[PDB]
């Protein structure tokens, strides 16, 4: 008479910033039509 997931194997969230992603990027990709594009891969908070 039991199931669910063990309360031991539950990675609780913790990262709840009010502000982040405070970095800098430079557009050096091959310009087309005068428009440069950059594809960033960021990690969303919790």
């Amino acid at each position: 008479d039991e199931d669910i997931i063990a309360e031991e194997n539950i990675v609780s969230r913790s990262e709840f910033p009010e502000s982040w992603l405070w970095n800098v990027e430079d557009l050096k990709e091959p310009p087309k039509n005068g428009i440069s594009t950059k594809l960033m891969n960021i990690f969303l908070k919790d």
Binding site: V11, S14, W20, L21, W22, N23, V24, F43
Partner: protein, 712 residues
């Protein structure tokens, strides 16, 4: 009776019976570790010892979990990626600070087989506090953003992890946090034979170098071996041989300290006392370490670590009466092997505190005397409580005192590698006792010229022949018979051989642009004619990018030249100092190196300098080979005089003195052989010569001085 083997195995693994069925050891296939505990004892109740984790939690079924590394559940002023509920082996993670923050340490770290992360701890500091950001070690959680003076920070590890080191660190005066850097440990991380030997010597040898100041060296080594029945003759006899090599290792350093061998169980047993006349004899102490046997404490196989340390207390105590002659000059090094599983006597920590009070340590805000006591602990027993063995071991900055090797065989290899290896033992930037002359490196230069001249400059002893100093203090016209150098406060003058100027030095190479003075590459060495005998008044000073400085900063031998520049000269308001002469008496002047965002403000003030009042571009008179100091922000830094010219720009860290610059020129002359200006302008800056820029020249001219310069 033998405990029943009913439901005592482990899922996805196995186990084996040892000590004739009195204990079992779980054997999990490579890539996995026994959970929770490694081994189990056979209680006399008929059942095996309950499965207790690190949080003292009861587990029903044992399982073989994969080797995971601690998760960074706390990181500030930056961002780490990728993020996962758990990190397997050979998993890589990178760190990156925000805008306006400097990243020190290893940016990329990989999870190793020892359940730990490679490289150093990643820290994102802005350099706005009195002390550098303590950072947040992977797996820990720092509480305290304020890094002012007297401020403190607390650390907390995740559930199921044992905190190693200090849980609280206070920003002490002089830009340095008390205790040591925390580190969340698990129950299988251990320490490679190299990690132990490397962190042990780097923490011991340094505590030995200072001892030589200065028969019978003023240092005591207390060898406390645990012979309880919870260790076994296997892990015991191995610990003996482990110590045997240690004594011989210390002997190779040509030092003969006072040893004290003590094996304890239910009651202490002193074999060698420091008060004996044979305590200095390494040979005898070794033979006494051989006569002992694990069978000595079989009848009464107890574990009373308290009485053990108390036995050491009586060896360093005194009638009183004494008050001994030289009690405040003796270093004490207590080394003890133990599983940390004490059960008789209570908390052995109480004794350690009594020892501190007896040696008067940590009882003075101005004189900590922490360098007069080291406590090294080594886990030997099958079940070792990292919590306890840590509470006893000392906590010093950038030093490790807690050790837990994989097995006994590895613990031996730790001391085998020592006997063969002979780390460089140099005393650069060192201070002796402490009349009054705490600046051995300091040198006073005088150049006699027609009419009068008496050019008054200063230098710094960097070797047994060469003395680093300014270059403008001399000229091509000045011969060697007209140049005299005095060191150690000696009345006589030393005869020089040749003054080597920098190949790129040209003070008169800017007159075309209307620039009378040009102190670019303003450095020069002075090779003496006679060899200098180092004493309590004469002693070299650490130079950037040297094997000697690497140890001074307590950094790994694999430290590159670039790493040292980031340590000594960060992108912040560095706290340095220089030597000034007031009323025929040397005195220190604490200043700040403007290497942060206040760098431009300090440089552009070179326009007020005589002759530079009509310079088009101020960046031409202030080459990257300059370190700007002095000013009003953040504090009112003392200015350099004319006689102080050529003086060493030292950075006092880790109780060591590292020269990083050379006094070149100042904006406003505040010294006129009368009184101090007192009304100094807010633009009265002082410029120096960054040694990190003139390395190629120093490394070449000092190739035959055994200073061990790094390649890079």
């Amino acid at each position: 009776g033998s405990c029943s083997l009913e439901g005592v195995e482990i899922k996805g693994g196995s186990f084996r019976l040892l000590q004739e069925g009195q204990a079992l050891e779980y054997v999990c296939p490579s890539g996995f570790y026994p959970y929770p505990v490694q081994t189990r004892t056979c209680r006399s109740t008929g059942s095996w010892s309950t499965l207790k984790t690190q949080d003292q939690k009861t587990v029903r079924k044992a399982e073989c979990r994969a080797i995971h590394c601690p998760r960074p559940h706390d990181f500030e002023n930056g961002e780490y990626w990728p993020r996962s509920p758990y990190y397997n082996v050979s998993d890589e993670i990178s760190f990156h600070c925000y805008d306006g923050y400097t990243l020190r340490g290893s940016a990329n770290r990989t999870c190793q087989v020892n359940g730990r992360w490679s490289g150093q701890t990643a820290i994102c500091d802005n350099g706005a506090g009195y002390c550098s950001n303590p950072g947040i070690p992977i797996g820990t959680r720092k509480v305290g953003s304020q890094y002012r003076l007297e401020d403190s920070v607390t650390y907390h590890c995740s559930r199921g992890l044992t905190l190693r080191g200090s849980q609280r660190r206070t920003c002490q005066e002089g830009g340095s946090w008390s205790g040591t850097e925390p580190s969340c440990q698990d129950s299988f991380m251990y320490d490679t034979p190299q990690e132990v030997a490397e962190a042990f010597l780097s923490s011991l040898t340094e505590t030995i170098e200072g001892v030589d100041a200065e028969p019978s060296g003023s240092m005591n080594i207390y060898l406390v071996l645990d012979g309880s029945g919870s260790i076994g003759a296997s892990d015991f006899t191995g610990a003996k041989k482990c110590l045997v090599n240690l004594i011989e290792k210390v002997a190779s350093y040509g030092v003969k300290p006072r040893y004290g061998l003590v094996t304890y169980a239910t009651y202490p047993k002193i074999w060698v006392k420091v008060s004996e006349a044979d305590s200095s004899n390494a040979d005898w102490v070794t033979k006494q370490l051989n006569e002992i046997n694990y069978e000595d404490h079989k009848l009464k196989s107890g574990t009373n670590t308290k009485k053990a340390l108390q036995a050491v207390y009586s060896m360093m105590s005194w009638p009183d009466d004494v008050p001994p002659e030289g009690w405040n000059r003796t270093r004490h090094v207590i080394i003890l092997m133990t599983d940390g599983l004490h059960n008789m006597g209570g908390d052995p920590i109480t004794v350690i505190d009594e020892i501190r009070d007896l040696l008067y340590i940590g009882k003075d805000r101005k004189n900590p005397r922490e360098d007069y006591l080291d406590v090294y602990v080594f886990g030997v027993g099958p079940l070792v409580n990292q919590v306890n063995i840590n509470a006893l071991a000392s906590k010093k900055d950038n030093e490790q005192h807690v050790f837990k090797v994989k097995d006994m065989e590895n613990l031996e290899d730790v001391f085998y590698q020592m006997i063969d290896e002979s780390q460089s033992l140099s005393l650069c930037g060192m201070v002796w006792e402490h009349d009054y002359h705490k600046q051995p490196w300091q040198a006073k230069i005088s150049v006699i010229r027609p009419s009068k001249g008496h050019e008054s400059c200063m230098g710094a002893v960097v070797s047994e022949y060469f003395v680093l100093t300014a270059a403008h203090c001399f000229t091509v016209d000045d011969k060697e018979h007209s140049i005299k150098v005095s060191v150690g406060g000696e009345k006589r003058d030393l005869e020089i051989e040749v003054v080597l100027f920098h190949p790129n030095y040209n003070i008169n190479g800017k007159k075309e642009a209307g620039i009378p003075e040009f102190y670019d590459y303003d450095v020069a060495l002075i090779k003496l004619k006679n060899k200098l005998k180092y004493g309590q008044t004469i002693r070299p000073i650490c130079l950037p990018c040297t094997e000697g400085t690497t140890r001074a900063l307590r950094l790994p031998p694999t430290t590159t030249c670039q790493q040292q520049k980031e340590e000594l000269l960060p992108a912040q308001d560095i706290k340095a100092l220089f030597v000034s002469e007031e009323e025929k008496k040397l005195t220190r002047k604490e200043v700040y190196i403007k290497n942060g965002d206040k760098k431009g403000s300090c440089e552009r003030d070179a326009q007020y300098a005589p002759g530079y009042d009509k310079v088009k571009d101020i960046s031409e008179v202030v080459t990257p080979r300059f370190l700007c100091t002095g000013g009003v922000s953040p504090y009112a830094d003392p200015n350099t005089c004319r006689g102080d010219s050529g003086g060493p720009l030292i950075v006092h860290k880790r109780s060591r003195f590292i020269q990083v610059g050379v006094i070149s020129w100042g904006v406003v002359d505040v010294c006129k052989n009368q009184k101090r200006q007192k009304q100094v302008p807010a633009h009265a800056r002082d410029f120096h010569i960054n040694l990190f820029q003139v390395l190629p020249w120093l490394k070449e001219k000092l190739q035959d001085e055994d200073l061990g310069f790094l390649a890079a």
